[PDB]
Design a binder for this molecule. Structure first.
Ligand SMILES: [Ca+2]
Ligand code: NI
Length: 335
């Protein structure tokens, strides 16, 4: 069974990943502990990034050197006030189990933590300007997670070397999820003093990003929302390619579930004033159904294509992106 320290790690996985912990726990063989630990170290790192009670001066040394703390048996952090702070307060338990992983997994996790911490620190003081900068921010906080997971799958040999080698596709898996979250979380981010929507895009509608929360600006807000969702849809071909290459059932389910939830979220958000002025619902018997069904390529394609079809026939002719939205959805289906 499990050591006392690993039992604790799985407790933290359940506390932090909730319903998704079961999907990680279903991973075959060596992948299970490797991904559990990777998830927990990523949670610790993100908890630092997100904690607005930690000054930039105090935070940057932690982000820069986080990858090194993996090799410091007594390193912990006791001052977080964030939801998942227990993984920081009891980091020694997590790092102990990290150091018990095979070297091949340690190398991947440490490298990703290094690169993510540097990129997270770079964006602390700045807003996202260009669409290219949006892609770069998303790479740092999510694309690298896709790349790291892919490298774990290939290192374990439960998946082919191609999976880890194709960093563009693995990065796209992360960007799709992260752009969907950023789109959905406009209001909570704005209220938390954070700005993630790219200025290159929103400045073609309003003078400040926070203006989209003003009711008189709702039509403009929804146009911008639709433009960003159109941007995110461009990652779907890569998501389909990525999922199509997986040969391990447990890996497939782990990779497919978040992507199906993302496309469902985009479809809920598309053309939806509630992003700015209310609360977007994704009917939650639906979330469990998508999870249950997303276990083979024909099923996952069916889900993706149906949500795209629903968006497609909802596109207003007057939307300034209406043509590109139809085009990208049409193009993906044509593929
Ligand atoms: Ca974060
Ligand atoms: Ni149609």
């Amino acid at each position: 069974s499990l050591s006392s320290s690993l039992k604790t790690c799985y407790k933290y996985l359940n506390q932090t990943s909730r319903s998704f912990a079961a999907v990680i726990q279903a991973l075959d063989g060596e992948m299970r502990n490797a991904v559990c630990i990777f998830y927990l170290v990523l949670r610790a790192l993100d908890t630092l990034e997100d904690d607005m009670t930690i000054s930039v001066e105090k935070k940057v040394p932690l982000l820069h050197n986080f990858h090194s703390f993996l090799y410091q048996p007594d390193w912990r952090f006791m001052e977080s006030k964030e939801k998942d702070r227990q993984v920081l307060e009891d980091f020694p338990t997590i790092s102990l189990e990290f150091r018990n992983l095979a070297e091949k997994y340690q190398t991947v996790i440490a490298d990703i933590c290094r690169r993510m911490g540097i990129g997270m620190a770079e964006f602390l003081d700045k807003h996202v300007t260009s669409e290219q900068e949006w892609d770069k921010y998303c790479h740092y906080v999510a694309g690298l997670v896709g790349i790291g997971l892919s490298r774990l799958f290939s290192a374990s040999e439960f998946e082919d070397p191609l999976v880890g080698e194709d960093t563009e596709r693995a990065n796209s898996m992360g960007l799709f999820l992260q752009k969907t979250n950023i789109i959905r979380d406009y209001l909570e981010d704005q209220q938390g003093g954070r700005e993630f929507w790219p200025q290159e895009v929103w400045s073609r509608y309003v003078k400040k990003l926070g203006d989209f929360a003003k009711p008189e600006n709702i039509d403009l807000a929804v146009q911008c929302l639709n433009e960003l969702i159109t941007n995110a849809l461009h990652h779907i071909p890569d998501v389909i390619t990525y999922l199509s290459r997986l040969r391990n059932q447990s890996v497939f389910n782990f990779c497919a579930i978040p992507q199906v939830m993302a496309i469902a979220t985009l479809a809920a958000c598309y053309n939806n004033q509630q992003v700015f002025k209310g609360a977007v619902k994704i009917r939650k018997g639906q979330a469990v159904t998508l999870m249950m069904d997303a276990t083979n390529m024909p099923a996952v394609k069916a889900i993706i294509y149906q949500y795209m079809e629903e968006i497609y026939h909802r596109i207003p002719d007057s939307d300034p992106s209406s043509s590109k939205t139809r085009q990208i959805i049409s193009t993906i289906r044509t593929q």
